[PDB]
Amino acid sequence: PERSMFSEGFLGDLHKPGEEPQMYPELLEEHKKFICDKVYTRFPPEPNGFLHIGHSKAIMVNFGYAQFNKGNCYLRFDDTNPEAEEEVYFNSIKEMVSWLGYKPWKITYSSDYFDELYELAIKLIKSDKAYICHCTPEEVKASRGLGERVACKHRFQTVEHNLREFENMKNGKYNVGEATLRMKQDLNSPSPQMWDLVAYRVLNTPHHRTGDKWKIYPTYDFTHCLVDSFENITHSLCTTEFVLSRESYEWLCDALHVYRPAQREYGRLNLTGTIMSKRKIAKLVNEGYVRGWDDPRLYTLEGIKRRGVPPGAILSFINTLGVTTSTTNIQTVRFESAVRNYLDQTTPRLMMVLHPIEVVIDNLDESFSLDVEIPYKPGKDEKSMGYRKLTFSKHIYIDENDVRAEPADKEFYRLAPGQPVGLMRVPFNISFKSIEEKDGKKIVHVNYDEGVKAKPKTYIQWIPKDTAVHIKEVRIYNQLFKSENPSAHPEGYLKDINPDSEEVLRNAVVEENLKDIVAKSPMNIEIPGSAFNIKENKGNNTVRFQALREGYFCLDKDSKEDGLILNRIVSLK
Numbered sequence: 001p002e003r004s005m006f007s008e009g010f011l012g013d014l015h016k017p018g019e020e021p022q023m024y025p026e027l028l029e030e031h032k033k034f035i036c037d038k039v040y041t042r043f044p045p046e047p048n049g050f051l052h053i054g055h056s057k058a059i060m061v062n063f064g065y066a067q068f069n070k071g072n073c074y075l076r077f078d079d080t081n082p083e084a085e086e087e088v089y090f091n092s093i094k095e096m097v098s099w100l101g102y103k104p105w106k107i108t109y110s111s112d113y114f115d116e117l118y119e120l121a122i123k124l125i126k127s128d129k130a131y132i133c134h135c136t137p138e139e140v141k142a143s144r145g146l147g148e149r150v151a152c153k154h155r156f157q158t159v160e161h162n163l164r165e166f167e168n169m170k171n172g173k174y175n176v177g178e179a180t181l182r183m184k185q186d187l188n189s190p191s192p193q194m195w196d197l198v199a200y201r202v203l204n205t206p207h208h209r210t211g212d213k214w215k216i217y218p219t220y221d222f223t224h225c226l227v228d229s230f231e232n233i234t235h236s237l238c239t240t241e242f243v244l245s246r247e248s249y250e251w252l253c254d255a256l257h258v259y260r261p262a263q264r265e266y267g268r269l270n271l272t273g274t275i276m277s278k279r280k281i282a283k284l285v286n287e288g289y290v291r292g293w294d295d296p297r298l299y300t301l302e303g304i305k306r307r308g309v310p311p312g313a314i315l316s317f318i319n320t321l322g323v324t325t326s327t328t329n330i331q332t333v334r335f336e337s338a339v340r341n342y343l344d345q346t347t348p349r350l351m352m353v354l355h356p357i358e359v360v361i362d363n364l365d366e367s368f369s370l371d372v373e374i375p376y377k378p379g380k381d382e383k384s385m386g387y388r389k390l391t392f393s394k395h396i397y398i399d400e401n402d403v404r405a406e407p408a409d410k411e412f413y414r415l416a417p418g419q420p421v422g423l424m425r426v427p428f429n430i431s432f433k434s435i436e437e438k439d440g441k442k443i444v445h446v447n448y449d450e451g452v453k454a455k456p457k458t459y460i461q462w463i464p465k466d467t468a469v470h471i472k473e474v475r476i477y478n479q480l481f482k483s484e485n486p487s488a489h490p491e492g493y494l495k496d497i498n499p500d501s502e503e504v505l506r507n508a509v510v511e512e513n514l515k516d517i518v519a520k521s522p523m524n525i526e527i528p529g530s531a532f533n534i535k536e537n538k539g540n541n542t543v544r545f546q547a548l549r550e551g552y553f554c555l556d557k558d559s560k561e562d563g564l565i566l567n568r569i570v571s572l573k
């Protein structure tokens, strides 16, 4: 069957809610009375960019564990750092959580706790566990041993001197960088994540949610653990990148006599052949190598969604990988295989011709009409998706590569002189007659070999000409880079772009019944017995189908009724 990842490995061996290891075990009664034996997790994306595919593991681990155990999961924006904070990041994050079929129990912000965090900075100062430093960034490197660690004169300032200076920082007394608030931890400890970390930095800038009220803003080292305690996070799950930071994490809570959440780290998801440098990908969008942050060639969530990948395929893929402390190293070919096997089960089959050539069946009359009924998914579940009718007549389209004017060879099974080809779901074959040159285009004349039972070597797809839908653009996508390590290219990652990563076909046609797939979309066909049957909302990305001999496609963001634009999700293979 399908073994869930939440009952195995890293997630299946986590503690029960309410049994988080505490230095002071009496801080659980106020914690237990809030959780009521429910799991409480968080998702804390920083809203200064788009989510890539790695965040889908962060989303699945945190919302999925909360949902698997009938608990709750916060959607917490980590707007600790005040900047321009463009609203599209906040929306895109919300949409990508909702798109993956997870509903947050409550949407919160890190800025929501600036008041409570300022009170705990005083308590830490009053506890002689912090101090204000006026050191330059070069000075603290020497005090950290850029070597032998030495203390600073500020560390021995009286408690009342720290209180006096911090109230000055609050009221915009000093400039950016000239004054900090460092935790008084331990300099003999070998962990560099404990060499008097900065807890508050003076910024004197407006925050998009709080404005000019705050002139000093805390750091990540101060914010993560304390906001987890405020929201009674039973399991605070993050990537193994911050495993050394768990000492300072647990330190700050034990230094303030607050509930100490359990930070357990999992290995992040690393796809081979992916660059994660936000600046590098920014360079691509600006110079035009891709047509937006949601370009179907990117491994950002918006781009993967626009490529046409169904959300359930992503989750089904992360689940089969599992979650351990070991960081992965998965080839993108295994990701495309998962999406391919998912669409094989959940999409209807349509007839599309990418490089059409007009066919004239000479021996058929103009009034001739043979209705051919075709199921949307031939197989064990035919009657579930329904049937459709195509009218076979004198004028049809087939693919240029399915007809050749010279006799065939051992590798060519399609239309040729002396070698008839079968038309899908059509009783009898068509035989080659001649090729007419007309209006620049080529027109193949055939006979319909009616009444003669002869097995063809293959059956090709075809479109009725009179009711064919003409597609403005079909975009065939491949890997954006030629190699699996673009940053290691001797001439730079820009010199490793795949020029053929996007091919735009201008003359494709598809059968009329695509209009029927749009009307039934969002279709949301389910994989029996699978736990990853996510229902989607309306949108061109949900209009998915398989072109019977070409691959899987969907409607792009830019598609309209009088201007269809298709994306090739993944090859047929």
Ligand SMILES: O=C(/C=C/c1cccs1)Nc1ncccn1
Residues within 6 Å of the ligand: 049, 050, 051, 052, 273, 274, 275, 276, 277, 278, 281, 297, 298, 299, 300, 480, 481
């Ligand atoms: O999509 C990204 C990276 C996306 C990011 C979003 C926000 C910060 S990085 N990288 C990629 N690399 C190789 C091939 C395709 N895609």
Ligand SMILES: [Zn+2]
Residues within 6 Å of the ligand: 133, 134, 135, 152, 153, 154, 155
């Ligand atoms: Zn100092």
